[PDB]
Amino acid sequence: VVRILGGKARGVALKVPASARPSPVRLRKALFDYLRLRYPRRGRFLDPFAGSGAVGLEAASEGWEAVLVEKDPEAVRLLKENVRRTGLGARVVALPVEVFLPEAKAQGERFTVAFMAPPYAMDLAALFGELLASGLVEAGGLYVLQHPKDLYLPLGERRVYGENALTLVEV
């Protein structure tokens, strides 16, 4: 019930398990209006906790070199089906974010943007802290954290969208 908003796969419906937020449309639409405005040259996009891939596939559709990591074999199954439906080229890494980050660093992996929208039931703060500490975003890039508007981080500027907020941390 969710579609890619722009780019090469604009309009394509994504299979999304009834167990998702899924992800506010004005939120996604706003994040990318900003991202293409701030990064016209694009770059590499990291999406840990990707689900069916709503945000990571949107980046891919918009010209980003997207890397999506997700642990749930179910979600991964849907993720791959979605990569197919959209016909987009994206790297799918099926493993826990807590394993990926360490390894990504050792491989000298780097990205321009790292978006994280983990399930609100987890400790969204310790998780953001870990992402921020990985140092995976190159100078000039961004760490974008989605969370309930009541959760507050002094790491950067925020934008509220109804009940969700996005915290953007510059590097």
PDB file of C-alpha atoms in Angstrom:
ATOM      1  CA  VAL A   1       0.000   0.000   0.000  1.00  0.00           C
ATOM      2  CA  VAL A   2       3.102   2.184  -0.307  1.00  0.00           C
ATOM      3  CA  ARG A   3       4.654   3.498  -3.515  1.00  0.00           C
ATOM      4  CA  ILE A   4       8.028   4.837  -4.579  1.00  0.00           C
ATOM      5  CA  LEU A   5       7.519   8.616  -4.703  1.00  0.00           C
ATOM      6  CA  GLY A   6      10.052   9.680  -7.332  1.00  0.00           C
ATOM      7  CA  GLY A   7      12.938   8.728  -9.578  1.00  0.00           C
ATOM      8  CA  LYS A   8      13.241   5.735 -11.901  1.00  0.00           C
ATOM      9  CA  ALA A   9      10.646   3.667 -10.014  1.00  0.00           C
ATOM     10  CA  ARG A  10       8.133   6.472  -9.359  1.00  0.00           C
ATOM     11  CA  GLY A  11       4.689   5.078  -8.618  1.00  0.00           C
ATOM     12  CA  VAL A  12       5.603   1.410  -8.144  1.00  0.00           C
ATOM     13  CA  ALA A  13       3.763  -0.315  -5.288  1.00  0.00           C
ATOM     14  CA  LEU A  14       5.864  -2.040  -2.666  1.00  0.00           C
ATOM     15  CA  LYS A  15       4.851  -5.248  -0.938  1.00  0.00           C
ATOM     16  CA  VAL A  16       4.759  -4.408   2.785  1.00  0.00           C
ATOM     17  CA  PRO A  17       3.924  -6.837   5.632  1.00  0.00           C
ATOM     18  CA  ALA A  18       0.927  -5.829   7.769  1.00  0.00           C
ATOM     19  CA  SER A  19       3.500  -5.546  10.558  1.00  0.00           C
ATOM     20  CA  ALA A  20       4.894  -2.177   9.427  1.00  0.00           C
ATOM     21  CA  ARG A  21       4.335   1.438  10.500  1.00  0.00           C
ATOM     22  CA  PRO A  22       4.509   1.556   7.544  1.00  0.00           C
ATOM     23  CA  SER A  23       6.137   4.988   7.022  1.00  0.00           C
ATOM     24  CA  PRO A  24       4.442   8.424   6.696  1.00  0.00           C
ATOM     25  CA  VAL A  25       4.207   9.718   3.135  1.00  0.00           C
ATOM     26  CA  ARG A  26       4.768  13.400   3.871  1.00  0.00           C
ATOM     27  CA  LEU A  27       7.773  12.314   5.926  1.00  0.00           C
ATOM     28  CA  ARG A  28       9.433  10.364   3.095  1.00  0.00           C
ATOM     29  CA  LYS A  29       8.432  12.999   0.573  1.00  0.00           C
ATOM     30  CA  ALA A  30       9.937  15.751   2.726  1.00  0.00           C
ATOM     31  CA  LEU A  31      13.154  13.919   3.531  1.00  0.00           C
ATOM     32  CA  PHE A  32      13.945  13.395  -0.143  1.00  0.00           C
ATOM     33  CA  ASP A  33      12.866  16.863  -1.309  1.00  0.00           C
ATOM     34  CA  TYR A  34      15.606  18.001   1.045  1.00  0.00           C
ATOM     35  CA  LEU A  35      18.108  15.289   0.133  1.00  0.00           C
ATOM     36  CA  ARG A  36      18.092  15.890  -3.610  1.00  0.00           C
ATOM     37  CA  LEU A  37      18.287  19.619  -2.893  1.00  0.00           C
ATOM     38  CA  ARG A  38      21.267  19.162  -0.565  1.00  0.00           C
ATOM     39  CA  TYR A  39      22.990  16.362  -2.489  1.00  0.00           C
ATOM     40  CA  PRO A  40      22.493  16.925  -6.220  1.00  0.00           C
ATOM     41  CA  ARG A  41      25.480  14.676  -6.831  1.00  0.00           C
ATOM     42  CA  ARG A  42      23.847  12.018  -4.662  1.00  0.00           C
ATOM     43  CA  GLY A  43      26.196   9.363  -3.358  1.00  0.00           C
ATOM     44  CA  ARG A  44      25.898   6.234  -1.229  1.00  0.00           C
ATOM     45  CA  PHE A  45      22.815   5.783   0.985  1.00  0.00           C
ATOM     46  CA  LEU A  46      22.774   3.408   3.976  1.00  0.00           C
ATOM     47  CA  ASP A  47      19.483   2.065   5.309  1.00  0.00           C
ATOM     48  CA  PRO A  48      19.903  -0.217   8.355  1.00  0.00           C
ATOM     49  CA  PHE A  49      16.609  -1.633   9.657  1.00  0.00           C
ATOM     50  CA  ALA A  50      15.226  -1.443   6.159  1.00  0.00           C
ATOM     51  CA  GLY A  51      11.935  -3.297   6.044  1.00  0.00           C
ATOM     52  CA  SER A  52      10.263  -4.054   2.753  1.00  0.00           C
ATOM     53  CA  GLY A  53      12.615  -1.233   1.772  1.00  0.00           C
ATOM     54  CA  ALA A  54      10.377   1.849   1.551  1.00  0.00           C
ATOM     55  CA  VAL A  55      13.105   4.384   2.307  1.00  0.00           C
ATOM     56  CA  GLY A  56      16.134   2.566   0.906  1.00  0.00           C
ATOM     57  CA  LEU A  57      14.382   1.779  -2.380  1.00  0.00           C
ATOM     58  CA  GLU A  58      13.238   5.388  -2.635  1.00  0.00           C
ATOM     59  CA  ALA A  59      16.891   6.423  -2.447  1.00  0.00           C
ATOM     60  CA  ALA A  60      17.812   3.878  -5.113  1.00  0.00           C
ATOM     61  CA  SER A  61      15.012   5.114  -7.333  1.00  0.00           C
ATOM     62  CA  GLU A  62      16.345   8.619  -6.947  1.00  0.00           C
ATOM     63  CA  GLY A  63      19.882   7.884  -8.043  1.00  0.00           C
ATOM     64  CA  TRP A  64      21.544   6.907  -4.763  1.00  0.00           C
ATOM     65  CA  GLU A  65      23.761   3.833  -4.449  1.00  0.00           C
ATOM     66  CA  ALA A  66      21.676   2.190  -1.732  1.00  0.00           C
ATOM     67  CA  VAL A  67      22.685  -0.420   0.807  1.00  0.00           C
ATOM     68  CA  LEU A  68      19.866  -1.958   2.829  1.00  0.00           C
ATOM     69  CA  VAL A  69      20.478  -4.150   5.845  1.00  0.00           C
ATOM     70  CA  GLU A  70      17.617  -6.088   7.490  1.00  0.00           C
ATOM     71  CA  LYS A  71      17.697  -9.103   9.845  1.00  0.00           C
ATOM     72  CA  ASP A  72      14.197 -10.559   9.535  1.00  0.00           C
ATOM     73  CA  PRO A  73      14.252 -13.229   6.791  1.00  0.00           C
ATOM     74  CA  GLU A  74      10.581 -12.424   6.129  1.00  0.00           C
ATOM     75  CA  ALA A  75      11.209  -8.742   5.527  1.00  0.00           C
ATOM     76  CA  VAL A  76      14.273  -9.669   3.489  1.00  0.00           C
ATOM     77  CA  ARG A  77      12.119 -11.933   1.347  1.00  0.00           C
ATOM     78  CA  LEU A  78       9.752  -9.039   0.681  1.00  0.00           C
ATOM     79  CA  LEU A  79      12.706  -6.687   0.263  1.00  0.00           C
ATOM     80  CA  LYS A  80      14.094  -8.767  -2.587  1.00  0.00           C
ATOM     81  CA  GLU A  81      10.689  -9.072  -4.189  1.00  0.00           C
ATOM     82  CA  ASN A  82      10.479  -5.289  -4.016  1.00  0.00           C
ATOM     83  CA  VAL A  83      13.938  -4.798  -5.511  1.00  0.00           C
ATOM     84  CA  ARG A  84      12.561  -6.912  -8.364  1.00  0.00           C
ATOM     85  CA  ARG A  85       9.242  -5.086  -8.786  1.00  0.00           C
ATOM     86  CA  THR A  86      11.056  -1.757  -8.872  1.00  0.00           C
ATOM     87  CA  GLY A  87      13.793  -3.105 -11.099  1.00  0.00           C
ATOM     88  CA  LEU A  88      16.224  -1.076  -9.054  1.00  0.00           C
ATOM     89  CA  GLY A  89      19.805  -2.012  -8.315  1.00  0.00           C
ATOM     90  CA  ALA A  90      20.370  -2.148  -4.578  1.00  0.00           C
ATOM     91  CA  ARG A  91      22.600  -4.115  -2.233  1.00  0.00           C
ATOM     92  CA  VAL A  92      20.630  -6.218   0.242  1.00  0.00           C
ATOM     93  CA  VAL A  93      22.531  -7.290   3.344  1.00  0.00           C
ATOM     94  CA  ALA A  94      20.595  -9.844   5.389  1.00  0.00           C
ATOM     95  CA  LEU A  95      21.918  -9.540   8.912  1.00  0.00           C
ATOM     96  CA  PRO A  96      21.482  -7.664  12.211  1.00  0.00           C
ATOM     97  CA  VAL A  97      22.547  -4.029  12.218  1.00  0.00           C
ATOM     98  CA  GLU A  98      24.748  -4.724  15.255  1.00  0.00           C
ATOM     99  CA  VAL A  99      26.858  -7.077  13.131  1.00  0.00           C
ATOM    100  CA  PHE A 100      26.832  -4.999   9.950  1.00  0.00           C
ATOM    101  CA  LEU A 101      28.147  -1.743  11.413  1.00  0.00           C
ATOM    102  CA  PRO A 102      31.374  -3.238  12.832  1.00  0.00           C
ATOM    103  CA  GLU A 103      32.065  -5.143   9.638  1.00  0.00           C
ATOM    104  CA  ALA A 104      31.140  -2.254   7.362  1.00  0.00           C
ATOM    105  CA  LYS A 105      33.696  -0.105   9.150  1.00  0.00           C
ATOM    106  CA  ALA A 106      36.501  -2.663   8.784  1.00  0.00           C
ATOM    107  CA  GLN A 107      35.781  -2.836   5.053  1.00  0.00           C
ATOM    108  CA  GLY A 108      36.329   0.898   4.851  1.00  0.00           C
ATOM    109  CA  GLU A 109      32.715   1.355   3.784  1.00  0.00           C
ATOM    110  CA  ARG A 110      31.478   4.929   3.526  1.00  0.00           C
ATOM    111  CA  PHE A 111      28.227   6.701   2.740  1.00  0.00           C
ATOM    112  CA  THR A 112      26.913  10.189   2.151  1.00  0.00           C
ATOM    113  CA  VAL A 113      23.664   9.532   4.020  1.00  0.00           C
ATOM    114  CA  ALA A 114      22.664   7.013   6.663  1.00  0.00           C
ATOM    115  CA  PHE A 115      18.930   6.846   7.411  1.00  0.00           C
ATOM    116  CA  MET A 116      17.655   4.834  10.341  1.00  0.00           C
ATOM    117  CA  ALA A 117      14.018   4.175  11.231  1.00  0.00           C
ATOM    118  CA  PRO A 118      14.101   1.218  13.646  1.00  0.00           C
ATOM    119  CA  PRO A 119      10.956  -0.160  15.304  1.00  0.00           C
ATOM    120  CA  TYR A 120       9.989   2.227  18.118  1.00  0.00           C
ATOM    121  CA  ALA A 121       9.876  -0.631  20.629  1.00  0.00           C
ATOM    122  CA  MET A 122      13.679  -0.804  20.653  1.00  0.00           C
ATOM    123  CA  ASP A 123      15.978   1.572  22.530  1.00  0.00           C
ATOM    124  CA  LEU A 124      15.990   4.303  19.901  1.00  0.00           C
ATOM    125  CA  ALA A 125      18.916   6.242  21.318  1.00  0.00           C
ATOM    126  CA  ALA A 126      21.353   3.494  22.113  1.00  0.00           C
ATOM    127  CA  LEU A 127      20.783   2.431  18.493  1.00  0.00           C
ATOM    128  CA  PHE A 128      21.336   5.945  17.123  1.00  0.00           C
ATOM    129  CA  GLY A 129      24.372   6.208  19.374  1.00  0.00           C
ATOM    130  CA  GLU A 130      25.845   3.090  17.790  1.00  0.00           C
ATOM    131  CA  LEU A 131      25.211   4.360  14.257  1.00  0.00           C
ATOM    132  CA  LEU A 132      26.748   7.738  15.090  1.00  0.00           C
ATOM    133  CA  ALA A 133      29.799   6.020  16.603  1.00  0.00           C
ATOM    134  CA  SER A 134      30.389   3.785  13.559  1.00  0.00           C
ATOM    135  CA  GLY A 135      31.680   6.841  11.729  1.00  0.00           C
ATOM    136  CA  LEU A 136      30.388   5.441   8.427  1.00  0.00           C
ATOM    137  CA  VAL A 137      29.212   8.771   6.939  1.00  0.00           C
ATOM    138  CA  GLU A 138      31.815  10.819   5.062  1.00  0.00           C
ATOM    139  CA  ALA A 139      32.519  14.452   5.913  1.00  0.00           C
ATOM    140  CA  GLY A 140      29.678  16.569   4.588  1.00  0.00           C
ATOM    141  CA  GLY A 141      27.156  13.752   4.891  1.00  0.00           C
ATOM    142  CA  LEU A 142      24.138  13.141   7.112  1.00  0.00           C
ATOM    143  CA  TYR A 143      22.824  10.781   9.772  1.00  0.00           C
ATOM    144  CA  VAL A 144      19.037  10.874   9.738  1.00  0.00           C
ATOM    145  CA  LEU A 145      17.146   9.338  12.623  1.00  0.00           C
ATOM    146  CA  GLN A 146      13.366   8.746  12.588  1.00  0.00           C
ATOM    147  CA  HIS A 147      11.586   8.331  15.915  1.00  0.00           C
ATOM    148  CA  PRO A 148       8.507   9.321  17.907  1.00  0.00           C
ATOM    149  CA  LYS A 149       8.350  13.111  18.285  1.00  0.00           C
ATOM    150  CA  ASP A 150       8.488  12.767  22.078  1.00  0.00           C
ATOM    151  CA  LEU A 151      11.947  11.190  21.926  1.00  0.00           C
ATOM    152  CA  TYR A 152      14.525  14.004  21.977  1.00  0.00           C
ATOM    153  CA  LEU A 153      18.160  14.107  20.836  1.00  0.00           C
ATOM    154  CA  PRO A 154      20.435  17.187  21.071  1.00  0.00           C
ATOM    155  CA  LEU A 155      22.604  15.805  18.261  1.00  0.00           C
ATOM    156  CA  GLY A 156      21.082  18.022  15.600  1.00  0.00           C
ATOM    157  CA  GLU A 157      18.132  19.886  14.152  1.00  0.00           C
ATOM    158  CA  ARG A 158      14.714  18.284  14.059  1.00  0.00           C
ATOM    159  CA  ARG A 159      11.678  18.277  11.786  1.00  0.00           C
ATOM    160  CA  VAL A 160       8.354  17.006  13.130  1.00  0.00           C
ATOM    161  CA  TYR A 161       5.724  15.281  10.957  1.00  0.00           C
ATOM    162  CA  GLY A 162       2.596  14.567  12.920  1.00  0.00           C
ATOM    163  CA  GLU A 163       3.654  11.951  15.470  1.00  0.00           C
ATOM    164  CA  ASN A 164       7.109  11.231  14.036  1.00  0.00           C
ATOM    165  CA  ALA A 165      10.240  13.342  14.026  1.00  0.00           C
ATOM    166  CA  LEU A 166      13.477  13.242  12.075  1.00  0.00           C
ATOM    167  CA  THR A 167      16.754  14.292  13.645  1.00  0.00           C
ATOM    168  CA  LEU A 168      19.421  15.308  11.165  1.00  0.00           C
ATOM    169  CA  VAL A 169      23.052  15.188  12.225  1.00  0.00           C
ATOM    170  CA  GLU A 170      25.631  16.803   9.982  1.00  0.00           C
ATOM    171  CA  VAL A 171      29.157  15.487   9.558  1.00  0.00           C
TER     172      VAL A 171
END
